[PDB]
Design a protein around this ligand. Structure first.
Ligand SMILES: [Mg+2]
Ligand SMILES: [Mg+2]
Ligand SMILES: [Zn+2]
Lengths: 66, 141, 38, 148, 176, 94
RNA sequence: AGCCAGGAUGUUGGCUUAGAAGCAGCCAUCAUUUAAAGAAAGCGUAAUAGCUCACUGGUCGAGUCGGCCUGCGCGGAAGAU
């Protein structure tokens, strides 16, 4: 999550697993499922929805050029 | 205790130990009885006072049920509802913000008499010094 | 193993040895610290 | 470590305990944890506080440097690891007792208890002691003798 | 120095038999054996051997030191004999012993069959264990090594021929 | 306390001065008072160690030339341009 | 230097962090209980856990630690008939 330019905000500790909360940019969560699976032996749900618009890092911005 | 095996400790609250997001399920999960945290917990909880932090250990292996071990209160937190400020700084420690009492630290530390090593019971105050120089707060001694 | 012109210690566990004419560095903790040609 | 001066203190402070003391006992703390000391300090605690010691010193070089003073029964006690225990006030007391009971709770060895001085000799757990003030065990001796 | 300077006890049960530069040592096991020395000078007599520099050798002492050390261990061998112990880890890693040859199954497309040398003998407490006692220290070492070599312990599941007094570091698998 | 043994210099000149320093000695001079100045040769390492202590510069110090005890205070030191060595010392006469 | 032990209590120090519990960072670094034990030198943890070092008691039994000025050497050092 951190590697994906992601921000963390909590951990609960939900019963048996551990709900992990993070704000991470969309353009970086692509194909998340596949690696999450690899990292967790295949046992790890996840979910996402839109939250907000934040500043793109410079390298990002100048790349996003049409 | 002549054989430690499991001593998870994440302070709780006296008036109603029965959470869910902070601790809740996982505060007794791996052969632990979640139910018993209201029968046995509060059997020594309301004995004292209700509301503020209370660290704790349990003695469960794979023995289903269990007996709940009471504990001490932290010694620096007794610098909030028994002192003054409730944060700790506000202004970076470049400047020593807080403010302390010399009257207190004696009997209000003494409250933690049974969890300290100082033979002299006024020595125990001398320990609350730095513990209550938590920001560099000096006492109008 | 790093083959540098300077070898030096990296961990407090890295020992420095001279086998043949060569100056080596052995580390009992971290394989990344192995070194020759000092 | 420290230089000479500080060894002397380790002596003069230790040897004015013996010069002004009561009872003496041993123990070899190979495994002497810290829960160990903590406890026996609450024991020194009940047994006043800081009236007692145990200054590990069994360097013959130290806690025998107080012995050719008194208690030269300890040229023999001072080999290997050892924890010398001095009494100041108090009956020639209990100090003795829980040393056996303690080390009889696993609590490491006790040097087999090479034992100590009040008389001038060796080993054997004695509660010939803290009865002391059991001059009531000479009060029940008044009316019972007087009556019966 | 120190090791060289210290002497060495010869416990009853040892013969010991110096000639020139050739010590020898039999015991309750103890396949005799005879090493050679050089810039070192040995001395018999006593219940002990004593090693020291020989005049005109910058290597002396430094050399004398090893001499003692070696001799010492021979005796120790000839007394209690030397240990060993390697345990196999990983599915289907059996070991046998068919006389003086150890039959191992180490996930290979062929059998290994390692033939023990002279003064070493071996036995198998379990299909997953091997122990070899012997006289010569340096050799049981050698054998233990070569036996370990057929499959040195790998760091992800520690599979392979271990040492027991091992450590086998091991490390968490990559992030895929 | 600092006692500085010394010998009168038989040779003066850069040639002599240089040769001196090679043999772990070094030239110095004593002046002050009403009596003439004296060309000295001291041993480097001895004095080199001494001048390490700050007192050397503050305390009054004594020099033993042919057993005479002149007793002077350090006026000036010439240190090497880049080595931990002494070149020259001026001693003023009290 | 080895080897045997301890290596602790306030306490997860405060702040800061989703989490900083001796140990990512900012600030302070005291008091105990002692033989001695840093508000910790390193490894380690998501953070705790866990493994060490500093330091101390034991064993051993005579030397031992690292800087300064220096002489000679070692690596650094790969090419074409
Ligand atoms: Mg010239
Ligand atoms: Mg070449
Ligand atoms: Zn390293």
């Amino acid at each position: 999550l951190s590697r994906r330019r992601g921000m963390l905000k909590g951990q609960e500790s939900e019963v048996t697993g551990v709900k992990i909360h993070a704000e991470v940019p969309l353009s970086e969560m692509f194909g998340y499922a596949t690696q999450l699976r690899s990292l967790t032996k295949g046992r790890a749900s996840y979910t996402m929805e839109f939250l907000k618009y934040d500043e793109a890092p410079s390298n990002v911005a100048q790349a996003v050029i049409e | 205790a002549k054989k430690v095996q499991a001593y998870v400790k994440l302070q709780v609250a006296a008036g109603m130990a029965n959470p869910s997001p902070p601790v809740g399920p996982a505060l007794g999960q791996q052969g632990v009885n979640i139910m018993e945290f209201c029968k046995a917990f509060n059997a020594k909880t309301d004995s004292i006072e209700k509301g503020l932090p209370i660290p704790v250990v349990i003695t469960v292996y794979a023995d289903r049920s269990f007996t709940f071990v009471t504990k001490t209160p932290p010694a620096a937190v007794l610098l909030k509802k028994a002192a003054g400020i409730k944060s700790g700084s506000g202004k970076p420690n470049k400047d020593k913000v807080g403010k302390i009492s010399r009257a207190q630290l004696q009997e209000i530390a003494q409250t933690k008499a049974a969890d300290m090593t100082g033979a002299d019971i006024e020595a125990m105050t001398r320990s609350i010094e730095g513990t209550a120089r938590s920001m560099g707060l000096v006492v109008e001694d | 193993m790093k083959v540098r012109a300077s070898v030096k210690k990296l961990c407090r566990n890295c020992k420095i040895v001279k086998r043949d004419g060569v100056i080596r560095v052995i580390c009992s903790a971290e394989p990344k610290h192995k070194q020759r040609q000092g | 470590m420290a230089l000479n001066l500080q060894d002397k203190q380790a002596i003069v402070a230790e040897v004015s305990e013996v010069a002004k003391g009561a009872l003496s006992a041993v123990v070899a703390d190979s495994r002497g944890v810290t829960v160990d000391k903590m406890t026996e300090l609450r024991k020194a605690g009940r047994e006043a506080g800081v009236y007692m010691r145990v200054v590990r010193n069994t360097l013959l070089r130290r806690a025998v440097e107080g012995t050719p003073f008194e208690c030269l029964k300890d040229a023999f006690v001072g080999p290997t690891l050892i924890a010398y225990s001095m009494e100041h006030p108090g009956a020639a007391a209990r100090l003795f007792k829980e040393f056996a009971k303690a080390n009889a709770k696993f609590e490491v060895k006790a040097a087999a208890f090479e034992g100590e001085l009040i008389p001038a000799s060796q080993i054997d757990r004695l509660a010939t002691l803290p009865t002391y003030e059991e001059a009531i065990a000479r009060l029940m001796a008044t009316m019972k003798e007087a009556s019966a | 120095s120190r090791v060289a300077k210290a002497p060495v006890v010869v416990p009853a049960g040892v013969d010991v038999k110096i000639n020139g530069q050739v010590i020898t040592i039999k015991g309750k096991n103890g396949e005799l054996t005879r090493t050679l020395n050089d810039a070192v000078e040995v001395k018999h007599a006593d219940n002990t051997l004593t090693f020291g520099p020989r005049d005109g050798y910058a290597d002396g002492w430094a050399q004398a030191g090893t001499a003692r050390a070696l001799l010492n261990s021979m005796v120790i061998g000839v007394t209690e004999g030397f240990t060993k112990k390697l345990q196999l880890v990983g599915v289907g890693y059996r070991a046998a012993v068919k006389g003086n040859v150890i039959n191992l199954s180490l996930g290979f497309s062929h059998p290994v069959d390692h033939q023990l040398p002279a003064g070493i003998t071996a036995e198998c407490p379990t299909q997953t264990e091997i122990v070899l006692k012997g006289a010569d220290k340096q050799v049981i070492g050698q054998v233990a090594a070569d036996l370990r070599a057929y499959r040195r312990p790998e760091p992800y599941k520690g599979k392979g021929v271990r040492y027991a007094d091992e450590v086998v570091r091991t490390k968490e698998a990559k992030k895929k | 306390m600092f006692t500085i043994n010394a010998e009168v210099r038989k040779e003066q000149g850069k040639g002599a001065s240089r040769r001196l320093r090679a043999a772990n000695k070094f030239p110095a001079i004593i002046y002050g008072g009403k009596e003439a100045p004296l060309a000295i040769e001291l041993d480097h390492d001895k004095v080199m160690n001494m001048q390490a202590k700050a007192e050397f510069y503050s305390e009054v110090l004594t020099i033993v030339v042919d057993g005479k005890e002149i007793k002077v205070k350090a006026q000036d030191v010439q240190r090497h341009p880049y080595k931990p060595k002494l070149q020259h010392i001026d001693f003023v006469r009290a």
